[PDB]
Amino acid sequence: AYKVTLKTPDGDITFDVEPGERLIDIGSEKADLPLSCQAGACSTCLGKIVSGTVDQSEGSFLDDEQIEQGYVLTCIAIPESDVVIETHKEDEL
Numbered sequence: 001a002y003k004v005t006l007k008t009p010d011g012d013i014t015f016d017v018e019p020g021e022r023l024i025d026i027g028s029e030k031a032d033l034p035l036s037c038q039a040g041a042c043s044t045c046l047g048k049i050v051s052g053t054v055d056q057s058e059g060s061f062l063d064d065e066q067i068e069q070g071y072v073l074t075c076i077a078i079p080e081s082d083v084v085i086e087t088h089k090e091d092e093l
């Protein structure tokens with residue numbers, strides 16, 4: 001499985017995700033994570049990837065530069081490695 005660490009403003013939590021699954025399913029169980037559209041079309045769930053890789057090609061909101069800087073729509077992101085993501089980042093846009 002992939003090891004996912006969510007670095008939230010109130011602490012870090014680490015959990016495993018079966019390959020191919022979205023991290024938000026167990027993530028929302030283990031932490032209070034902000035969501036709105038749940039479909040990759042807003043920035044409510046924005047996070048920043050610190051290490052590892054995701055597939056977030058389901059998303060439509062971020063521009064190429066934001067993706068290149070490591071921003072991630074956590075509601076649709078699918079890990080492709082162990083990943084560390086800082087959550088609650090929408091105020092940086």
Ligand code: FES
Pocket residue numbers: 034035036037038039040041042043044045046061073074075076
């Ligand atoms: S909740 Fe809208 S993009 Fe994730």
